[PDB]
Amino acid sequence: MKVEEILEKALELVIPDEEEVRKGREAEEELRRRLDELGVEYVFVGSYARNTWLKGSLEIDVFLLFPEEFSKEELRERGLEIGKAVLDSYEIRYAEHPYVHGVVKGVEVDVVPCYKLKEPKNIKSAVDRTPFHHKWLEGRIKGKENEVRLLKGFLKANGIYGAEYKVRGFSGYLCELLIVFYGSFLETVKNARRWTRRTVIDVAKGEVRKGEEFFVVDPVDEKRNVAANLSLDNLARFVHLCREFMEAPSLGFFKPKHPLEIEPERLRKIVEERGTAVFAVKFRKPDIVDDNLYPQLERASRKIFEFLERENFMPLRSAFKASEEFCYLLFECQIKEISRVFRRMGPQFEDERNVKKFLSRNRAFRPFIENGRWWAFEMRKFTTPEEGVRSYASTHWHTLGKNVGESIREYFEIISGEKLFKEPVTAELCEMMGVKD
Amino acid sequence: MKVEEILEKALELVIPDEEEVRKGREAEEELRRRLDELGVEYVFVGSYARNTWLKGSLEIDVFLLFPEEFSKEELRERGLEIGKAVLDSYEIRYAEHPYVHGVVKGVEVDVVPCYKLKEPKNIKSAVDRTPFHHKWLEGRIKGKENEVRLLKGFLKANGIYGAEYKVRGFSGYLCELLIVFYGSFLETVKNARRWTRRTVIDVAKGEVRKGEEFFVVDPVDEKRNVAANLSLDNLARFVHLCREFMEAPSLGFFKPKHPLEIEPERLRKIVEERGTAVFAVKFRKPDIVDDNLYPQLERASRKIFEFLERENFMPLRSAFKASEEFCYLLFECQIKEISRVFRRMGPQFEDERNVKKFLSRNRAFRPFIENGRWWAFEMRKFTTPEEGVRSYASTHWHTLGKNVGESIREYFEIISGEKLFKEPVTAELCEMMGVKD
RNA sequence: GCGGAUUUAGCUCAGUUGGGAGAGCGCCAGACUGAAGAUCUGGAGGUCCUGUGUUCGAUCCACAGAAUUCGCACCA
RNA sequence: GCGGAUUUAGCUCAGUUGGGAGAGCGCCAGACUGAAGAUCUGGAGGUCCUGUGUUCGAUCCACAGAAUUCGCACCA
């Protein structure tokens, strides 16, 4: 669609200027006031300070640099003293060393105690690194901020922007590092088409090489992978979207695509036509952070997946959804019903000892030999994958993560077909089964 | 049941003396007459000559030794000339070098041209070896003939006596060699409990050792495995029956056990309770020898077995029966119905070339990535193992042996449940599923 | 008939994740030697038995066939 | 919290068919030496991280746990 046109029309949905821009300055000014009132060494960092934040994603990050001659707890008292007096409403978030989150004029503000540490390698944790992150990008990104926003937008539209585990996609800082390295969104897109699972981007030397994993080198600390949270699968998605974009560019790569919103009638048909067993594990949501839940949900999903493999219902895919109330573990298998009878692996014919024991056990059918080894017909306790998972969930809850497993242990349901379609899992089911529009 | 008593009561069902013993002598005498009438060098061998044949299993083996200074075809003319004149009704069976099979007074007689070859290593085929076989066992078996008959009886009662492929069990000559080696049936049974898949019995040296396969050394030619036809599985069966006999001896080890003879009503229930898919491939019997058909049937069964494994209906066992009219390939699977959808293995994400092609193909559902590799949902052409086999039989008949495959190629049926129970396959189905009485 | 095993470099053979065609020996060269050899380096060297099919992709999966090899035995 | 990787002989590590507990090094010995070393032979050497469970059978499969290790990050 001409390429450059859609790049510019995308900006009116990317660039903030819903006149929150000034609300930033207003809060900043106000923030700058009260802060200079207490004579503290302070820095504005993150999205706001570089004028790089997305439309609606307004956030002030304030990092309070504290003398390189104090102690952990002496900065503690301070961050509090300050945060409180400068913010309008507050909470305390402790991380690895605590910080104050609050609100100034409807703008989410992050008041954070730091160190006036000037120059790296003398770093203790991830927090003290962001000032340097800002420092290095400051002045080296000036002018190219729009191109960053395009990248972000591109990634958000297809749901791979973010460092949080719910996404495992691209971190903002990474995006910035990228735009810097290539020159613009596009020159990034072009080269991304040639990325591999072993492609390494050292921004510090301006060099591209092959390593062991996909690695983007932090120009501040060359021991740091900025793209550490980028999952294997997401990276590939990005690469493929870059190949798909260049060949036939369109604006639909920048619009966030919306729910397919189906009726139970069309979904049941798909299932029927698929001839697959579709079911889910429902259980109440344990009240914990997002960056804890999804990892557990994933682990939980995987084990059940692995289970149904062992018991040979042959699952296709697995999916998960977390509402404000419950959690759902979705599964589609190739086997609706398995036989009650199965092969039980018995001893080689020579080990008379073990033979007898194996034979001493009482069964409904005679054991036999095949390839110089005994085998026996025995009975399963479950015939459908629903029945099997029920057995598994009830007996092997503990392995399904700490909080998730406990929530299942205490209670769970298994929902099949028409009943399940009524649950808020429509979107993911379609995504799991790969339904067209 | 006392042990020795049942050994003696078994003999009245083992020792011939249904007064066919004299019919032997009568025919022998008559045979000896006409033969000496033509001045031929002749020998009586096999079961009859040693008085070792089973009750009802009466057969005269006559091997016509011919001068060690003739040629293949010059003996040929002779065997005929002789066979005809001495037998009452005849056929010609060609083997590797032909022979005359016929009847003298209702007794199946085998008139065979040989060589007066005295002493081995100058042998050409299996036929010229039997005189030496008889020669070596003659006089070294005298007195111990009853003990041989016990062994035979033991093996026949449980259906592992015979060198023909329908059985793949113990050859008579082998049994004799055994009784000779240990001393009696029992001393054979005791030691057989300690046989392995690598136990070697050299009768010539009177020695037991370990080799590579189960090997019984022919005292005549030490390059010959007498137990070559003994299948792995049958050997084990024998060994296990020897262990089972010594621990609790009973006469039921000598009675041939009879059909379980079931109704369709009890069989359907078992199937239902088993929850398994049971079906068979029916097709007309190609008119060929037994030692050709069963090998093919086996091969045929196996491939179908292997197929259902590939397509994951997960078969349990496989069985075959050959009537005077049709042949049956019986199968029991763990999967009655499989989903219409399956995983299609696609390329790794890097090989852009192959990616596109894989994606160019049209499907009902979107392809995806998992572990850096593309996968696609596609449709099977069959949902039940019956449907699948139908597809397989029709497309892959040729591999199912020469004659068998051709018979299926031209025609076949697949029969399920109630319909199949009406077919003469009741016994084997019970044997395949391991049903109790 | 019949069945199993085998078929990848000149020789002898590995090769299982369906994506890299390999080792040893032989041959050529380099290093080393006074020489040659022995050792270390390296290089060249291919109809993965043939055909067709399955697959995005084939030494590998399927079918047909070929060749080598061992045995099976019918006979009964 | 949160996740992954790892845990087999004194050290460093193989170990995939669920049935044999292994290699290299180290140590002792034999052979060889004038000696010792170097090489070849061999031997000893084990809580397969623990527990419980599955199985005829447990390094291998399942659950709980431990320890080592790397990273995840929430924060928003």
Instruction: Verify whether the Cβ–Cβ distance B364 to A338 is below 8 Å.
Output: no
Give the count of alpha carbons within 13 A of A42, CB side only.
24
Answer yes or no: do A274 and B335 touch at CB < 8 A: no
d(CA A104, CA A110) in angstroms, rounded, equals 10
Please name the member of B197, B339, B367 whose beta carbon is closest to the beta carbon of A334. B339
Q: Is the CB of B112 under 7 A from strand C?
A: yes
Q: Is the CB of B358 under 7 A from strand C?
A: yes
* Lookup result for tokens 């792995």: B232
* A178/A217 Cα distance (integer angstroms): 11
CB A281 within 8 A of CB A414: yes
Instruction: Give the nearest partner residue to A334 out of B342, B349, B368, using CB atoms.
Output: B342
Q: How many CB atoms lie within 10 A of CB A309?
A: 12
Separation CA B394–CA B411 (nearest Å): 9
Closest residue of B to A192, CA-based?
A: B350
Q: Are the C-beta atoms of A353 and A360 separated by less than 8 Å?
A: no
Determine whether B8 is exposed, middle or buried from the number of CB atoms within 10 Å of its CB (0-12, 13-18, 19+).
exposed
A to B CB pairs, distance under 8 Å: 120
Distance between CA atoms of A112 and A41, rounded to whole angstroms? 12
Nucleotides of D under 7 A from a protein CB: 1-4, 18-19, 55-57, 61-65, 71-76
Strand boundaries in A373-412, DSSP class E: 373-379
The answer to whether B434 contacts A377, with C-beta atoms less than 8 Å apart, is yes
CB of B29 nearer than 7 A to strand C: no
> What is the SS3 assignment for A158?
coil
Do B372 and A236 count as a contact with CB atoms less than 8 A apart?
Answer: yes
- Nearest residue on chain B to A369, judged by CA atoms? B233
Residue A350 has its nearest CB partner, among B196, B349, B370, at B196
Interface test mutation site (partner B, options A334, A342, A387, A436, max chain B beta carbons within 10 A): A334
Query: What is residue A380's DSSP assignment?
Result: -
Q: Which two three-digit tokens encode residue A368? A: 């036999």
- Known binding residue A161? Answer is yes
Which residue type is seen at A27?
A
Residue A25 CB-density burial (10 A; 0-12 exposed, 13-18 middle, 19+ buried) = exposed
Mutate to test the interface with B, among A301, A335, A369 (most CBs of B within 10 A): A335
Cα(A75)–Cα(B147) distance, integer angstroms: 101
Would the CB atoms of B334 and A312 count as touching at under 8 Å? yes
Q: Which long-range contacts (CB under 8 A, 24 or more apart) does A296-301 make?
A: A296/A400, A296/A401, A296/A402, A296/A403, A296/A404, A296/A405, A297/A322, A297/A327, A297/A329, A297/A401, A297/A404, A299/A400, A299/A401, A299/A404, A300/A329, A300/A400, A300/A401, A300/A404, A300/A405, A300/A408, A301/A329
Chain B residue with minimal CA distance to A380? B274
Please name the method used to determine this structure.
X-ray
Nearest nucleotide to B400 by CA–C1' distance?
A: C63
Neighbours of B383 (CB within 10 A): 15
Cα of A274 vs its chain's centroid, Å: 29
Cα of A29 to nearest chain B Cα, Å:
48
Is residue B403's beta carbon less than 7 angstroms from any atom in nucleic acid strand C? yes
CA B211 to chain centre: 24
Longest dimension (CA), chain B: 90
Dist. CA B261–CA B263, nearest whole Å: 7
Q: How many Å apart are CA B285 and CA B36, to the nearest integer?
A: 44
Burial of B31 (0-12, 13-18, 19+ CB in 10 A): buried
Nearest-CA residue of chain B relative to A366?
B434
- A237, A339, A349 ranked by CB distance to B275: nearest: A339
Q: Per the CB < 8 Å rule, is A352 touching B243?
A: yes
CA B171 to chain centre: 11
> CA A337 from chain center: how many Å?
34
CB atoms within 10 A of CB A256: 10
Is B348 (CB) below 7 Å from strand C?
A: yes
Residue A59, marked binder: yes
Radius of gyration of chain B, Cα coordinates, nearest whole angstrom: 28
List, in order of start, the domains of chain A with CATH numbers: 1-15+144-259 (1.10.1410.30), 16-143 (3.30.460.10), 260-339+384-437 (3.30.70.590), 340-383 (3.30.70.1550)
Residue A274: which of B336, B341, B372 has the nearest Cβ? B341
Measured distance CA(A432)–CA(B263) in Å, rounded:
48
Distance A227 CA to C47 C1' (A): 48
B46 nearest nucleotide via C1' and CA:
C76
